[PDB]
Amino acid sequence: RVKMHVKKGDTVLVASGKYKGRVGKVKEVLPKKYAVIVEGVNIVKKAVRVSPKYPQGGFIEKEAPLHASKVRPICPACGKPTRVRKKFLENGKKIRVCAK
Amino acid sequence: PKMKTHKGAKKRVKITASGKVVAMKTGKRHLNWQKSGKEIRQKGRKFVLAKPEAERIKLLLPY
Amino acid sequence: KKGLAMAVADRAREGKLLLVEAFAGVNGKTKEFLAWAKEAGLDGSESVLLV
RNA sequence: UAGCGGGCGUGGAUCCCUGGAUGUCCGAAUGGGGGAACCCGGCCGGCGGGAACGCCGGUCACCGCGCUUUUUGCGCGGGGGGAACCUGGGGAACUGAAACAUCUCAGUACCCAGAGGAGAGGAAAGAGAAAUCGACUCCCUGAGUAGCGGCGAGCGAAAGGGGACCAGCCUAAACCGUCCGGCUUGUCCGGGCGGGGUCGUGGGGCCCUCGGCAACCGAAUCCCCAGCCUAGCCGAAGCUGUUGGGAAGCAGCGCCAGAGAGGGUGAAAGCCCCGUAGGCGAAAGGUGGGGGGAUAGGUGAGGGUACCCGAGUACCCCGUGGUUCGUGGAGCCAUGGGGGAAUCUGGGCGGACCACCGCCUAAGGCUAAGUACUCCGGGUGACCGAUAGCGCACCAGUACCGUGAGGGAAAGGUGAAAAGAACCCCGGGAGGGGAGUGAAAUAGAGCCUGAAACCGUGGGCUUACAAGCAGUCACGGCCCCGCAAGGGGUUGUGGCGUGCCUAUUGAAGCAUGAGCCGGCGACUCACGGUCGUGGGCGAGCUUAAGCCGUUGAGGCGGAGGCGUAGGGAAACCGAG
Ligand SMILES: [Mg+2]
Ligand SMILES: [Mg+2]
Ligand SMILES: [Mg+2]
Ligand SMILES: [Mg+2]
Ligand SMILES: [Mg+2]
Ligand SMILES: [Mg+2]
Ligand SMILES: [Mg+2]
Ligand SMILES: [Mg+2]
Ligand SMILES: [Mg+2]
Ligand SMILES: [Mg+2]
Ligand SMILES: [Mg+2]
Ligand SMILES: [Mg+2]
Ligand SMILES: [Mg+2]
Ligand SMILES: [Mg+2]
Ligand SMILES: [Mg+2]
Ligand SMILES: [Mg+2]
Ligand SMILES: [Mg+2]
Ligand SMILES: [Mg+2]
Ligand SMILES: [Mg+2]
Ligand SMILES: [Mg+2]
Ligand SMILES: [Mg+2]
Ligand SMILES: [Mg+2]
Ligand SMILES: [Mg+2]
Ligand SMILES: [Mg+2]
Ligand SMILES: [Mg+2]
Ligand SMILES: [Mg+2]
Ligand SMILES: [Mg+2]
Ligand SMILES: [Mg+2]
Ligand SMILES: [Mg+2]
Ligand SMILES: [Mg+2]
Ligand SMILES: [Mg+2]
Ligand SMILES: [Mg+2]
Ligand SMILES: [Mg+2]
Ligand SMILES: [Mg+2]
Ligand SMILES: [Mg+2]
Ligand SMILES: [Mg+2]
Ligand SMILES: [Mg+2]
Ligand SMILES: [Mg+2]
Ligand SMILES: [Mg+2]
Ligand SMILES: [Mg+2]
Ligand SMILES: [Mg+2]
Ligand SMILES: [Mg+2]
Ligand SMILES: [Mg+2]
Ligand SMILES: [Mg+2]
Ligand SMILES: [Mg+2]
Ligand SMILES: [Mg+2]
Ligand SMILES: [Mg+2]
Ligand SMILES: [Mg+2]
Ligand SMILES: [Mg+2]
Ligand SMILES: [Mg+2]
Ligand SMILES: [Mg+2]
Ligand SMILES: [Mg+2]
Ligand SMILES: [Mg+2]
Ligand SMILES: [Mg+2]
Ligand SMILES: [Mg+2]
Ligand SMILES: [Mg+2]
Ligand SMILES: [Mg+2]
Ligand SMILES: [Mg+2]
Ligand SMILES: [Mg+2]
Ligand SMILES: [Mg+2]
Ligand SMILES: [Mg+2]
Ligand SMILES: [Mg+2]
Ligand SMILES: [Mg+2]
Ligand SMILES: [Mg+2]
Ligand SMILES: [Mg+2]
Ligand SMILES: [Mg+2]
Ligand SMILES: [Mg+2]
Ligand SMILES: [Mg+2]
Ligand SMILES: [Mg+2]
Ligand SMILES: [Mg+2]
Ligand SMILES: [Mg+2]
Ligand SMILES: [Mg+2]
Ligand SMILES: [Mg+2]
Ligand SMILES: [Mg+2]
Ligand SMILES: [Mg+2]
Ligand SMILES: [Mg+2]
Ligand SMILES: [Mg+2]
Ligand SMILES: [Mg+2]
Ligand SMILES: [Mg+2]
Ligand SMILES: [Mg+2]
Ligand SMILES: [Mg+2]
Ligand SMILES: [Mg+2]
Ligand SMILES: [Mg+2]
Ligand SMILES: [Mg+2]
Ligand SMILES: [Mg+2]
Ligand SMILES: [Mg+2]
Ligand SMILES: [Mg+2]
Ligand SMILES: [Mg+2]
Ligand SMILES: [Mg+2]
Ligand SMILES: [Mg+2]
Ligand SMILES: [Mg+2]
Ligand SMILES: [Mg+2]
Ligand SMILES: [Mg+2]
Ligand SMILES: [Mg+2]
Ligand SMILES: [Mg+2]
Ligand SMILES: [Mg+2]
Ligand SMILES: [Mg+2]
Ligand SMILES: [Mg+2]
Ligand SMILES: [Mg+2]
Ligand SMILES: [Mg+2]
Ligand SMILES: [Mg+2]
Ligand SMILES: [Mg+2]
Ligand SMILES: [Mg+2]
Ligand SMILES: [Mg+2]
Ligand SMILES: [Mg+2]
Ligand SMILES: [Mg+2]
Ligand SMILES: [Mg+2]
Ligand SMILES: [Mg+2]
Ligand SMILES: [Mg+2]
Ligand SMILES: [Mg+2]
Ligand SMILES: [Mg+2]
Ligand SMILES: [Mg+2]
Ligand SMILES: [Mg+2]
Ligand SMILES: [Mg+2]
Ligand SMILES: [Mg+2]
Ligand SMILES: [Mg+2]
Ligand SMILES: [Mg+2]
Ligand SMILES: [Mg+2]
Ligand SMILES: [Mg+2]
Ligand SMILES: [Mg+2]
Ligand SMILES: [Mg+2]
Ligand SMILES: [Mg+2]
Ligand SMILES: [Mg+2]
Ligand SMILES: [Mg+2]
Ligand SMILES: [Mg+2]
Ligand SMILES: [Mg+2]
Ligand SMILES: [Mg+2]
Ligand SMILES: [Mg+2]
Ligand SMILES: [Mg+2]
Ligand SMILES: [Mg+2]
Ligand SMILES: [Mg+2]
Ligand SMILES: [Mg+2]
Ligand SMILES: [Mg+2]
Ligand SMILES: [Mg+2]
Ligand SMILES: [Mg+2]
Ligand SMILES: [Mg+2]
Ligand SMILES: [Mg+2]
Ligand SMILES: [Mg+2]
Ligand SMILES: [Mg+2]
Ligand SMILES: [Mg+2]
Ligand SMILES: [Mg+2]
Ligand SMILES: [Mg+2]
Ligand SMILES: [Mg+2]
Ligand SMILES: [Mg+2]
Ligand SMILES: [Mg+2]
Ligand SMILES: [Mg+2]
Ligand SMILES: [Mg+2]
Ligand SMILES: [Mg+2]
Ligand SMILES: [Mg+2]
Ligand SMILES: [Mg+2]
Ligand SMILES: [Mg+2]
Ligand SMILES: [Mg+2]
Ligand SMILES: [Mg+2]
Ligand SMILES: [Mg+2]
Ligand SMILES: [Mg+2]
Ligand SMILES: [Mg+2]
Ligand SMILES: [Mg+2]
Ligand SMILES: [Mg+2]
Ligand SMILES: [Mg+2]
Ligand SMILES: [Mg+2]
Ligand SMILES: [Mg+2]
Ligand SMILES: [Mg+2]
Ligand SMILES: [Mg+2]
Ligand SMILES: [Mg+2]
Ligand SMILES: [Mg+2]
Ligand SMILES: [Mg+2]
Ligand SMILES: [Mg+2]
Ligand SMILES: [Mg+2]
Ligand SMILES: [Mg+2]
Ligand SMILES: [Mg+2]
Ligand SMILES: [Mg+2]
Ligand SMILES: [Mg+2]
Ligand SMILES: [Mg+2]
Ligand SMILES: [Mg+2]
Ligand SMILES: [Mg+2]
Ligand SMILES: [Mg+2]
Ligand SMILES: [Mg+2]
Ligand SMILES: [Mg+2]
Ligand SMILES: [Mg+2]
Ligand SMILES: [Mg+2]
Ligand SMILES: [Mg+2]
Ligand SMILES: [Mg+2]
Ligand SMILES: [Mg+2]
Ligand SMILES: [Mg+2]
Ligand SMILES: [Mg+2]
Ligand SMILES: [Mg+2]
Ligand SMILES: [Mg+2]
Ligand SMILES: [Mg+2]
Ligand SMILES: [Mg+2]
Ligand SMILES: [Mg+2]
Ligand SMILES: [Mg+2]
Ligand SMILES: [Mg+2]
Ligand SMILES: [Mg+2]
Ligand SMILES: [Mg+2]
Ligand SMILES: [Mg+2]
Ligand SMILES: [Mg+2]
Ligand SMILES: [Mg+2]
Ligand SMILES: [Mg+2]
Ligand SMILES: [Mg+2]
Ligand SMILES: [Mg+2]
Ligand SMILES: [Mg+2]
Ligand SMILES: [Mg+2]
Ligand SMILES: [Mg+2]
Ligand SMILES: [Mg+2]
Ligand SMILES: [Mg+2]
Ligand SMILES: [Mg+2]
Ligand SMILES: [Mg+2]
Ligand SMILES: [Mg+2]
Ligand SMILES: [Mg+2]
Ligand SMILES: [Mg+2]
Ligand SMILES: [Mg+2]
Ligand SMILES: [Mg+2]
Ligand SMILES: [Mg+2]
Ligand SMILES: [Mg+2]
Ligand SMILES: [Mg+2]
Ligand SMILES: [Mg+2]
Ligand SMILES: [Mg+2]
Ligand SMILES: [Mg+2]
C-alpha cells in the first residue's frame, strides 16, 4: 500500500553514485526494501556455496539492489520525471516531454 | 494560593490611614475593683504598636 | 499600541516604509508579483513585511 | 523470514476500505459439575451394522416485566467489561492545632451500587429588598467579602453584575364513557383502559352565552438531503562542469512557485524520490438537524357553583445531617422517632417569635445545549534523547522474586550497500596470520564515536644506611626537544611541611563520611503578598471570563479591581 514508486521491470538510468550515468533495464524491484535491481552495483560475494545443496555456489558478482530513488525512468531522449496522464478509457503515465 | 486575611487581627486591630496600626489598651474588663480612676480613663484610649505593628499588617493586606 | 506605532515609525524614519495601491499584479501568482515588485524597488534584496 | 521445497499475478493478484462467512475451549458463561480452559447429562434429529458405544446439529441457567384461560408456555429485558470523568450508599488516619479532646486533614483516601458518552442538575411551595429577578448547569467577578471558629489552628458562602448555552414539558385529582369483580341498585364500592386536566394574571372540573373554525404555533419523534467519517487520486520547476569513496557541496547558466512544510536519496536538493500549496473522489457502512418535509401535540372571553388541585404529607415536638453557620437569637432544606390537618377565606417562605407588607404553590415525573474526562485517532512543542523519556524505544508488566495479594529489571547503533571475509596457513576447536571487500575493518559482527578507574608490554630518569599527608623551595646529575642564551621529564642532597569534608570552645586527630572511577543527585513552580528596580499612563490606571481574528497575529471586551477622605463599635458626620 502506498509503496508505489518510480518505474518497474523496464529501462531506466542510474543517477546513483558509483554507477552514475549507467543505464539498463531494471530486472527486479523490491518495494518492501524500496530498492531496484538493474545491471550495475555488481558486487564480489566471495562466499562459497549459497544454498546448503550443490557444489560450487559461485563468487557471483550478483547485482546489488539500489535505493529506488537512485534510478530514474528514461524515454526517447534523456532521463525524465513521470507525469500521470489519463486517456478517455483509463490511465497511462506520460513522461514530461513525450508519452510512457 | 490567595492569602486569607487573619480574622483574629481584623477583629481587634485597625490599620490607620498613614500606616500605623491601633488597638485598645490591655487589662480593663475585669482587672479593676477599685483601681485608680486615672487608670481606667487611660486604659480607655487606644494606641500604636511598632514592630509587631508591622507584623500585624501582613496578616491583612486585602484589608 | 505605542510599540506598533514606534515600529512603523522607526521603519518610516529609516525610509524603508512604503504605502502602495497599484497592485497591478493581483490574482494569486508569484511570477506576476515578482514583476510588480521589480517595477517597485523590491528587488528581493531586503526582507519585506507585505501588509 | 533468509533457507529447503513448491506456487500465484494485467481473465488483473498481494495490499487498503466496506459488508458478509467461519469462528474449537474458558470466561457475565447460561443444561449440570468444576481445582477457568476440564468432566457428566435430559430432550429432538443425524451419522456408523448401530440396541448396548460414540460422534454431530439443535435445545435446556437464573431474575425482572408483560401477557398466558390458571396450569405449561410466548414475548421483551437484565447479568459482565470499560483509562479517567459522573451520581449515590458508606467513610478513615497520619497531619495541622508547634501537646490534645472540640476543630483540622475531609466528606479527602478507600469500599460499595449505579449511569453514560457524558453524569448530575433542571421549569420556583425559588431568590431577598429592588413592590426587583424569572429552570438548570459552566467560566469571570462579587470575595478571601458576609460569616463560621477551643472567635484557636483554620474554614469560608449567596444575591447581584460580566459571559457560555438557551426549552421547555408530561402527569395525579374532580368529571364523562367502557370492561371485570361487589352489593344493600345509587352520577354507588373497588380495579384496569380511554377521554378530560396540569397552575400563582391562581388553574382546572361541571353548568349558561359567542366562532360551532379555516387558521396560527409545532417538535426533544420520525423521513429526505447537504455536509463529515471509514480506502484513495491529480499535483509546477534543472542541466553542464568540478572535487569526492559517494554531490545535495563548489562553479556557470536556467526554471517553478496558491507549492522555499518535512522526510529520503552514500555529504548540505524548491525543480531526484515521497510529499508540500491548491484541487478531486465512495458501490458499502457510520455519522447527520446544518437545510427540507411530515406527524405527535398545542390555543379564546365573560357569568354562575364552591366539585378538584398529590397524607401519616403539611404542621409541632424529640434525635441528627446539609448550608458560611461548631446550639448559637438558629431560620431555611433534609428526616430516624412521637403527636397529626386543611384544598385557595388552603398552605410554605422572606434567619427565634407576633403584627403588617410582599414572594411562592410542597408532599408525582421527564427534558437537549453550554460542563468533566482521555482507553482511542490527529496535530503541535524555547518536552526527553537510552542512568533521560511511560516501569517497557528491544519479544515487558516479561525475566526473576513471593504461598498469595504483590513486587519488578536490565537490554537501542556494522556499513551508503552484506559487499558479513572464499581460498591457503597454525589450531581438536576457539582464536588468529595471509588474502579479499570497503571510503574507512583502529567499521569484523553486541561491530559509530570509545572518556576514567583498572590490567599489561616497551622505553627515559630513579631507588637496597634509610624514618615517610608523599609535597614544595633551591642546587646538582642523567635523558630529551631548539647547533645555539632557553624549555620538558626524572630525582640526589639540603630548607620547610599535622590529608579532605562534616561537626565543634577546640581536629592531623585514636570524633563523622568517603575503596577507586564514570554517570544520576538537592532552594523549584503556581497563586497571594512586601520591598527594590526597568518601563507605559496619570486624578487616574487596568481589564476578567468571553467574543471576532489568526494558525506562533492580534484586536474587541469595563463586569470588576486599586486610587481620588478620613474618624467612629455604630447610628452619623466629614477635612475633619
Ligand atoms: Mg505504480
Ligand atoms: Mg562518481
Ligand atoms: Mg487569585
Ligand atoms: Mg484567622
Ligand atoms: Mg476585654
Ligand atoms: Mg462584659
Ligand atoms: Mg471582685
Ligand atoms: Mg499601683
Ligand atoms: Mg472611660
Ligand atoms: Mg488563483
Ligand atoms: Mg502558476
Ligand atoms: Mg507564479
Ligand atoms: Mg517470505
Ligand atoms: Mg533473498
Ligand atoms: Mg507466471
Ligand atoms: Mg481473456
Ligand atoms: Mg483487476
Ligand atoms: Mg465484518
Ligand atoms: Mg471482514
Ligand atoms: Mg466477520
Ligand atoms: Mg468451521
Ligand atoms: Mg458454572
Ligand atoms: Mg442459553
Ligand atoms: Mg476440572
Ligand atoms: Mg441420539
Ligand atoms: Mg458392518
Ligand atoms: Mg443409529
Ligand atoms: Mg455434540
Ligand atoms: Mg447436547
Ligand atoms: Mg424458572
Ligand atoms: Mg430478585
Ligand atoms: Mg413470569
Ligand atoms: Mg401479571
Ligand atoms: Mg399487556
Ligand atoms: Mg394460563
Ligand atoms: Mg388458577
Ligand atoms: Mg408462568
Ligand atoms: Mg429476548
Ligand atoms: Mg482499559
Ligand atoms: Mg461519594
Ligand atoms: Mg487526631
Ligand atoms: Mg494546613
Ligand atoms: Mg499535632
Ligand atoms: Mg507539632
Ligand atoms: Mg504527642
Ligand atoms: Mg478527630
Ligand atoms: Mg466535613
Ligand atoms: Mg460527596
Ligand atoms: Mg457528615
Ligand atoms: Mg466524620
Ligand atoms: Mg445492586
Ligand atoms: Mg458503572
Ligand atoms: Mg452504563
Ligand atoms: Mg445517553
Ligand atoms: Mg446531560
Ligand atoms: Mg459533549
Ligand atoms: Mg439528564
Ligand atoms: Mg451540578
Ligand atoms: Mg434528573
Ligand atoms: Mg428595605
Ligand atoms: Mg423598579
Ligand atoms: Mg437577575
Ligand atoms: Mg415562574
Ligand atoms: Mg449553578
Ligand atoms: Mg469548567
Ligand atoms: Mg466561560
Ligand atoms: Mg470575638
Ligand atoms: Mg491553639
Ligand atoms: Mg470543611
Ligand atoms: Mg450571578
Ligand atoms: Mg450570570
Ligand atoms: Mg466556556
Ligand atoms: Mg465556548
Ligand atoms: Mg370473582
Ligand atoms: Mg364475595
Ligand atoms: Mg373505584
Ligand atoms: Mg370510584
Ligand atoms: Mg367506578
Ligand atoms: Mg372506572
Ligand atoms: Mg391526556
Ligand atoms: Mg382551558
Ligand atoms: Mg371556572
Ligand atoms: Mg428542540
Ligand atoms: Mg476511507
Ligand atoms: Mg484515510
Ligand atoms: Mg487533478
Ligand atoms: Mg504524485
Ligand atoms: Mg543535458
Ligand atoms: Mg554535481
Ligand atoms: Mg566543498
Ligand atoms: Mg549552483
Ligand atoms: Mg540564458
Ligand atoms: Mg535530508
Ligand atoms: Mg545548504
Ligand atoms: Mg544544513
Ligand atoms: Mg553552507
Ligand atoms: Mg529535501
Ligand atoms: Mg484556480
Ligand atoms: Mg481541496
Ligand atoms: Mg492534499
Ligand atoms: Mg470533496
Ligand atoms: Mg476515489
Ligand atoms: Mg454514504
Ligand atoms: Mg451513489
Ligand atoms: Mg447497500
Ligand atoms: Mg445503511
Ligand atoms: Mg462504522
Ligand atoms: Mg462517525
Ligand atoms: Mg449516536
Ligand atoms: Mg433541504
Ligand atoms: Mg399535523
Ligand atoms: Mg372559565
Ligand atoms: Mg356543588
Ligand atoms: Mg389521606
Ligand atoms: Mg388527601
Ligand atoms: Mg408519606
Ligand atoms: Mg427528649
Ligand atoms: Mg428537627
Ligand atoms: Mg446543625
Ligand atoms: Mg461550640
Ligand atoms: Mg460542622
Ligand atoms: Mg455564636
Ligand atoms: Mg432560645
Ligand atoms: Mg420562620
Ligand atoms: Mg421524621
Ligand atoms: Mg388548614
Ligand atoms: Mg393565598
Ligand atoms: Mg390564612
Ligand atoms: Mg417548610
Ligand atoms: Mg416550618
Ligand atoms: Mg424566601
Ligand atoms: Mg426557640
Ligand atoms: Mg419565594
Ligand atoms: Mg403520586
Ligand atoms: Mg443536560
Ligand atoms: Mg449537557
Ligand atoms: Mg474547557
Ligand atoms: Mg490519545
Ligand atoms: Mg495522541
Ligand atoms: Mg502525536
Ligand atoms: Mg528535540
Ligand atoms: Mg540503556
Ligand atoms: Mg504507564
Ligand atoms: Mg526503569
Ligand atoms: Mg513498546
Ligand atoms: Mg509503550
Ligand atoms: Mg516469547
Ligand atoms: Mg516487549
Ligand atoms: Mg529499575
Ligand atoms: Mg541496510
Ligand atoms: Mg565489493
Ligand atoms: Mg551474516
Ligand atoms: Mg582470517
Ligand atoms: Mg601460508
Ligand atoms: Mg590447515
Ligand atoms: Mg578445549
Ligand atoms: Mg580459522
Ligand atoms: Mg588483511
Ligand atoms: Mg579509531
Ligand atoms: Mg594507531
Ligand atoms: Mg551477526
Ligand atoms: Mg552481535
Ligand atoms: Mg565481542
Ligand atoms: Mg581504550
Ligand atoms: Mg574496545
Ligand atoms: Mg583506558
Ligand atoms: Mg599503566
Ligand atoms: Mg608501564
Ligand atoms: Mg615500566
Ligand atoms: Mg627519550
Ligand atoms: Mg650505623
Ligand atoms: Mg603536611
Ligand atoms: Mg636550576
Ligand atoms: Mg639542574
Ligand atoms: Mg656526559
Ligand atoms: Mg646522548
Ligand atoms: Mg628541568
Ligand atoms: Mg624532592
Ligand atoms: Mg626534600
Ligand atoms: Mg615530616
Ligand atoms: Mg563536643
Ligand atoms: Mg584519644
Ligand atoms: Mg591514623
Ligand atoms: Mg566513635
Ligand atoms: Mg555523629
Ligand atoms: Mg577521620
Ligand atoms: Mg562527612
Ligand atoms: Mg566512594
Ligand atoms: Mg568507613
Ligand atoms: Mg565494598
Ligand atoms: Mg561517584
Ligand atoms: Mg538518572
Ligand atoms: Mg539542581
Ligand atoms: Mg529559595
Ligand atoms: Mg507572577
Ligand atoms: Mg510574587
Ligand atoms: Mg519605577
Ligand atoms: Mg517612568
Ligand atoms: Mg511609574
Ligand atoms: Mg488628566
Ligand atoms: Mg478575573
Ligand atoms: Mg457566540
Ligand atoms: Mg477561530
Ligand atoms: Mg480561537
Ligand atoms: Mg495563531
Ligand atoms: Mg495561509
Ligand atoms: Mg507562519
Ligand atoms: Mg488572544
Ligand atoms: Mg482587529
Ligand atoms: Mg464600569
Ligand atoms: Mg472600572
Ligand atoms: Mg469606567
Ligand atoms: Mg456591558
Ligand atoms: Mg481584588
Ligand atoms: Mg492615594
Ligand atoms: Mg468603618
Ligand atoms: Mg459630627
Ligand atoms: Mg478646612
Swiss-Prot record, chain A:
Q: Per the UniProt entry, what species is this protein from, by scientific name? A: Thermus thermophilus (strain ATCC BAA-163 / DSM 7039 / HB27)
Q: What do the Gene Ontology cellular component annotations say?
A: ribonucleoprotein complex; ribosome
Role according to the record: One of two assembly initiator proteins, it binds directly to the 5'-end of the 23S rRNA, where it nucleates assembly of the 50S subunit.
* Protein name from the UniProt record: Large ribosomal subunit protein uL24
| Assembly mode | Part of the 50S ribosomal subunit.
Taxonomically, which superkingdom?
Bacteria
By sequence similarity, the record places it as follows: Belongs to the universal ribosomal protein uL24 family.
Task: Output the Gene Ontology terms for molecular function.
Answer: rRNA binding; structural constituent of ribosome
Q: Which Pfam families does the record associate with it?
A: KOW, ribosomal_L24
Gene Ontology BP terms: translation
What keywords appear on the UniProt entry? Ribonucleoprotein, Ribosomal protein, RNA-binding, rRNA-binding
Q: Highest lineage ranks of the organism? A: Bacteria, Thermotogati, Deinococcota, Deinococci, Thermales
Q: Which Gene3D superfamilies match?
A: 2.30.30.30
UniProt keyword Transcription, yes or no? no
From Swiss-Prot, chain B:
Q: What are the recorded GO MF terms, alphabetically? A: structural constituent of ribosome
Kindly give the Pfam families that the UniProt entry links to this protein.
Answer: Ribosomal_L35p (PF01632)
Cellular component GO terms, alphabetical: cytosolic large ribosomal subunit
Task: Output the InterPro entries linked to this UniProt entry.
Answer: Ribosomal_bL35, Ribosomal_bL35-like, Ribosomal_bL35_CS, Ribosomal_bL35_sf
Residues in the signal sequence: none
Q: Which domain of life is it from?
A: Bacteria
Q: Which GO terms describe its biological process?
A: translation
Enumerate the UniProt keywords alphabetically: Ribonucleoprotein, Ribosomal protein
SUPFAM superfamilies reported in the protein's UniProt record = L35p-like (SSF143034)
Q: Which Gene3D superfamilies match?
A: 4.10.410.60
* HAMAP family per record: Ribosomal_bL35
- Give the protein family: Belongs to the bacterial ribosomal protein bL35 family.
Protein name (record): Large ribosomal subunit protein bL35
Q: Which gene encodes it?
A: rpmI
From Swiss-Prot, chain C:
Report the superkingdom from the record: Bacteria
Q: Which family is this protein grouped under?
A: Belongs to the universal ribosomal protein uL4 family.
Q: How does it assemble?
A: Part of the 50S ribosomal subunit.
Described by its record, this protein's role is as follows:
One of the primary rRNA binding proteins, this protein initially binds near the 5'-end of the 23S rRNA. It is important during the early stages of 50S assembly. It makes multiple contacts with different domains of the 23S rRNA in the assembled 50S subunit and ribosome.
Protein's name in the database? Large ribosomal subunit protein uL4
The record's gene field reads: rplD
